[PDB]
Amino acid sequence: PIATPEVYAEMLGQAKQNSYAFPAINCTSSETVNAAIKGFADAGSDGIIQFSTGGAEFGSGLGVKDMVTGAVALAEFTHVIAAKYPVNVALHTDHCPKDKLDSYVRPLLAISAQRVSKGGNPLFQSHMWDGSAVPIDENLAIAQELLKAAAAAKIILEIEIGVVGGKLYTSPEDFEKTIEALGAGEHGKYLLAATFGNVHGVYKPGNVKLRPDILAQGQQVAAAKLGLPADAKPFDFVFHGGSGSLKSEIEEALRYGVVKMNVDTDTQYAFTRPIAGHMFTNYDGVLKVDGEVGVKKVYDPRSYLKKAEASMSQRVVQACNDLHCAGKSLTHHH
Amino acid sequence: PIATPEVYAEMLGQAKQNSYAFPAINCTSSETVNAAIKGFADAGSDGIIQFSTGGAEFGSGLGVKDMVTGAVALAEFTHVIAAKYPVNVALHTDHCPKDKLDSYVRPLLAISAQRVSKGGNPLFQSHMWDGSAVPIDENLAIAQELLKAAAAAKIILEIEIGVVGGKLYTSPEDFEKTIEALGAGEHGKYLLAATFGNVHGVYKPGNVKLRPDILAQGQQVAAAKLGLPADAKPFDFVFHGGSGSLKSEIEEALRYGVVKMNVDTDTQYAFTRPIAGHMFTNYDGVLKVDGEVGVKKVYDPRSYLKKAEASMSQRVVQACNDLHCAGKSLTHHH
Amino acid sequence: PIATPEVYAEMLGQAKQNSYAFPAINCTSSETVNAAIKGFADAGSDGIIQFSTGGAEFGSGLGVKDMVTGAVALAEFTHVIAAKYPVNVALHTDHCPKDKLDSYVRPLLAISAQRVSKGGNPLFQSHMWDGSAVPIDENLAIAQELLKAAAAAKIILEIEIGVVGGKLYTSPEDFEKTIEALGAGEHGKYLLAATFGNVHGVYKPGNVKLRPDILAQGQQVAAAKLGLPADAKPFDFVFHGGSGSLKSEIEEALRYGVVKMNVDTDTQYAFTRPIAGHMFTNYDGVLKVDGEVGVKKVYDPRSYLKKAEASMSQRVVQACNDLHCAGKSLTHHH
Amino acid sequence: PIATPEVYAEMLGQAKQNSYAFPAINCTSSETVNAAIKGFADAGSDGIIQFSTGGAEFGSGLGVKDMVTGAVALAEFTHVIAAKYPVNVALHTDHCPKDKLDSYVRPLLAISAQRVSKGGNPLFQSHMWDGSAVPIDENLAIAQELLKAAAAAKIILEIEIGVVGGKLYTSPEDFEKTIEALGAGEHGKYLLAATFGNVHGVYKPGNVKLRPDILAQGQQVAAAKLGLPADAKPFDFVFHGGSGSLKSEIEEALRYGVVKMNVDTDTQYAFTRPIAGHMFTNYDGVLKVDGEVGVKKVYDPRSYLKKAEASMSQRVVQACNDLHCAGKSLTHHH
Numbered sequence A, B, C, D: 001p002i003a004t005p006e007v008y009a010e011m012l013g014q015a016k017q018n019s020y021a022f023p024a025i026n027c028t029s030s031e032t033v034n035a036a037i038k039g040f041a042d043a044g045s046d047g048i049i050q051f052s053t054g055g056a057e058f059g060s061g062l063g064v065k066d067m068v069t070g071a072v073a074l075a076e077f078t079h080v081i082a083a084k085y086p087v088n089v090a091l092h093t094d095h096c097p098k099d100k101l102d103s104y105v106r107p108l109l110a111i112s113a114q115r116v117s118k119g120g121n122p123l124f125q126s127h128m129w130d131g132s133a134v135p136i137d138e139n140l141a142i143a144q145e146l147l148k149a150a151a152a153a154k155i156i157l158e159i160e161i162g163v164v165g166g167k168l169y170t171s172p173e174d175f176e177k178t179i180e181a182l183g184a185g186e187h188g189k190y191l192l193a194a195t196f197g198n199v200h201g202v203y204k205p206g207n208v209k210l211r212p213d214i215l216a217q218g219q220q221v222a223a224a225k226l227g228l229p230a231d232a233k234p235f236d237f238v239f240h241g242g243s244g245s246l247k248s249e250i251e252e253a254l255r256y257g258v259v260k261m262n263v264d265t266d267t268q269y270a271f272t273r274p275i276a277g278h279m280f281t282n283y284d285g286v287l288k289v290d291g292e293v294g295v296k297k298v299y300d301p302r303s304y305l306k307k308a309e310a311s312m313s314q315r316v317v318q319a320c321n322d323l324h325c326a327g328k329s330l331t332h333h334h
């Protein structure tokens, strides 16, 4: 099923308590949504499906391009699909900067508030406010106001301090201001994308230098502010730029309270890879060549997109294993 | 918008009265649905989106494969999308044989009956019963019963007499039995896929030999049964196997009361064609070659699927022109 | 074997007397030479292998690019190969304009004169002087001098009046001047590339408009000058731009004394076509992909170049059939 | 120029004295010969071009396949080409087993004996007898007889003890028998392909385990037999299976008297690699697609084969650097 707010809060609470995390897979379509959920199910794992602003715009079609429309259309698709799987799937929206709040996060929040309102559950179970491009006090002012609105709609807010590369490098002051403005969950659950050298994309395995100790110190700074024991983990962290990371980097981040790792680039490669192979091996079936009419069985989009789906699903199971949520779905279907 | 039952009945009535037809485009995904609707809109045309049993199963994902689930999920996606376009879009299900009625058409009908029931409109605006593989009397017994159920749910039934190739060749007796069992619309609107040498797929332009005069004689046989003038067109015909047809064959069929032409193979080729081109020209970006890491900007599925969508949309505008429904949307947005 | 001068003169004399012609295939390499000769042999036909200035430069390698070197190296290769076939193969050099005479035709002629000289046969059996870019009187002054040198070396000269496209359109005056300056073979055999709308390359079958009647009138103009019967054919014509021609155009040209048709573009396509197919179907063998090491058996150049050779040979047999020299080799191996 | 026997003997003597070696590049065509020589020249290096039995058969064309013909035709091509470069190029024939001696090595030897005979130099400067599949005494009986014939024709003989993989692993007894039967050059220069775990082909960099100490001990065994100081290097070794070797393995082998390293697989990959890339990026130029006529400029074989040649040349310069013969041509063109 779709994760109810209560099961999503339980998911994140269990992950944190047990030092594991959930993959948050960026999807753009019926096929990628299907591939992601099948990956979660194959791994016996709960998971998160997220739509970026560009993914939602793509979802709405070239004749719309409207973020809300694409996010709603894909969310309604996903609600029908996820009901047929025995794992919990949460819906999330990814990075939304200040000038897109009015055309993405706020309207989607208002849609969920009205559902809630009528005794139903929200359409999405979390939304991201990415205020990292504005000064921290303004980021956190907007965050505080959005947190109240999200909590009232049974929705978890994700926020960001520090910029994810495409400085890097969240400061002590920012961690302290965050706890001061928002508390530690008593005013509504929030997820914190604190940056620690993360980069969106995949580079040669040497190139991206992560500093997970930044997360460890953020936990200590918060625990001190809250008068907690020094090993407490008051933040639920989000690891952006997950694709291309070393296993050891993922493991270390899990130790410091990462409960959600975002992956897009690697599942993109996984999806595309057998489509590429299909076109090459079937070149004279997918092209009308030398006066011939091609071969319908290989230019039928389903022929290669089933292969794309299965391949993306396999990469999603790898993410569930890497993050240690495989075999741990709160539905306990073993 | 999605076509209400009343506007769908008006669409088909207008098409018939004016000897034009609507394309019924087989879709399998968010992308193909988006491409089809954009094609209708670009042509200033109303249109039909249909899901085959295999398309619905594909729509539900490899971890489901359930026809109803895939059809419902794609229909809910389409409802959100179509609200953002100023043309009318009808949802249809394609060929359903006897042994799939209980797992496709009947459950979808029951879903629409309950919506109707609560004062709403049906989820799909028509469903196909393909009884061509059973004797005509059994075909038409099932048809009569389904027509009553469909009409009660504000849904148009499509039926088939004769087999579409992949004998061909609907008989006089079958036309007469059809009018006798079902009447001419007074007991509920139905669409008749009478076969006349149609073949699903595309072959070298010489190969498929259509006999539209079969449709002309079916109209005369019916008009005689109904005691109508000899030029009356009591049937609303469906042209299966539309891809690869000559313009002149399409024109002749329109003269005899074809109001709906099914196209799948040609929009498949149109969708796939630039994906093929994208993989070849970007071979060293979509593959990780010689120790390199590929190029995210070209293995991002959206990079080639936007090109697939636009290309399929162009082929859908061609179908609206070929069928003379371009520029004729009942919304009159000019 | 390589055609001796006497058998090459007999070849051209027989072709003319019987209204057939030989393909003159442009080659650039050991593989293309092998493909051309195998094509002649497979068709039971004699034939001509020719090297253009750019083909000879390519033949000499990127570290040389020297026309004479490439032509000599490829000619020596061909001498060894052709000795193993039971058809006659003539070696020719293609278009040489005025500013390349000193670095191509003249040095090659001097090489053959020295062989002849020592009681041997020339290295090439014909050379082309392409003077079509200079005024006709200068063209024919150079031609007369070259004809004397070529005849003394047992070599046939090809000349050109009119430009082959890439005006078109040889004039009556040019035909008359040619016979006046050079006679009709008594002063040494020459081949005349008279242009009649020929174009090098291949375009959509509609595009190139040939005017073979130009050749018919050139024969009549010459026969009148020589005081011969009006049906005499004093010229041995060369058909440039043979690729992409209609069969009917080829047939008509043969009626007017064409004894040699040049083909390059079509045998290029034939050679390349299965190399293309080989790379696509074996994409993950010819590329080192996803950390793998490729597959030697498919990146071995011989794997695809054997397929290229056989395919080019097949196109050369088609040319022997089109030109009616198939089955007519003067060796009479049946 | 082509290496005279005297300069080839000087080449090998200099390489041995200075612990460097020459690449022996397998070629199959005019293009690969051109690429190899340009590579030697670009590296300021002398080098060896070799033809295997299958390369010679391929060289002769599908209508011949005759080893002697292909080897002679390619050797005559190479003689013309190599005269235009300021480095020395030696011609060699690769592995010839017992049942091909009568149809490859022996006839080629007889051709060189007749040239020598008339006061000229041999056509090839070395030939390989591969007797590794027969017992050592028979191998060396044939070797002794061939060495006499080769030396009389001014030709160096290469022999093999141990099998190159596609046991591995030349024995002390075999080294001693070799020196006993053939001496150490006083009866004619020979090259010894002693095997030490070499494998033809390229595998993942981990897989092939070379044991160069086998060569070191073979030198000591020979030096002891000859009553020489223990650091003497009586054998001139040949390193088969050079492609895919680590630099450190190549360096170690050079220390023990390797003067010739055979490379084929890596120069195959280098040649093919840009042909592959050319076909993908120009897919709609090398194929006639969607009723179009392709693009001559990219299906002209020279368009991609010039790129193949330059790429293979670059890999040959890498081999000259790896083997430390770069910058050392005995022509001293700096």
Ligand SMILES: O=P(O)(O)OC[C@@H](O)CO
Pocket: A026, A052, A053, A054, A055, A094, A095, A200, A264, A265
């Ligand atoms: O903007 P997208 O759709 O490329 O995806 C966004 C995330 O993956 C990282 O910004």
Ligand SMILES: O=P(O)(O)OC[C@@H](O)CO
Pocket: B026, B052, B053, B054, B055, B094, B095, B200, B264, B265
């Ligand atoms: O079964 P599909 O999905 O290939 O499509 C069905 C129609 O297009 C014709 O049967």
Ligand SMILES: O=P(O)(O)OC[C@@H](O)CO
Pocket: C026, C052, C053, C054, C055, C094, C095, C200, C264, C265
């Ligand atoms: O110059 P090339 O090598 O392209 O060939 C020349 C002829 O085929 C026509 O000019």
Ligand SMILES: O=P(O)(O)OC[C@@H](O)CO
Pocket: D026, D052, D053, D054, D055, D094, D095, D200, D264, D265
């Ligand atoms: O037989 P080839 O032509 O594949 O080449 C032979 C050598 O490279 C190793 O046996």
Ligand code: NA
Pocket: A199, A200, A201, A202, A240, A241, A242, A243, A244, A245, A265
């Ligand atoms: Na990343």
Ligand code: NA
Pocket: B199, B200, B201, B202, B240, B241, B242, B243, B244, B245, B265
């Ligand atoms: Na069709």
Ligand code: NA
Pocket: C199, C200, C201, C202, C240, C241, C242, C243, C244, C245, C265
């Ligand atoms: Na042409």
Ligand code: NA
Pocket: D199, D200, D201, D202, D240, D241, D242, D243, D244, D245, D265
């Ligand atoms: Na090797």
Ligand SMILES: [Zn+2]
Pocket: A095, A164, A200, A240, A241, A262
């Ligand atoms: Zn991100």
Ligand SMILES: [Zn+2]
Pocket: A332, A333, A334
């Ligand atoms: Zn459990």
Ligand SMILES: [Zn+2]
Pocket: B095, B164, B200, B240, B241, B262
């Ligand atoms: Zn159909």
Ligand SMILES: [Zn+2]
Pocket: B332, B333, B334
């Ligand atoms: Zn209007």
Ligand SMILES: [Zn+2]
Pocket: C095, C164, C200, C240, C241, C262
């Ligand atoms: Zn020409």
Ligand SMILES: [Zn+2]
Pocket: C332, C333, C334
């Ligand atoms: Zn005969």
Ligand SMILES: [Zn+2]
Pocket: D095, D164, D200, D240, D241, D262
């Ligand atoms: Zn070898």
Ligand SMILES: [Zn+2]
Pocket: D332, D333, D334
């Ligand atoms: Zn020097």
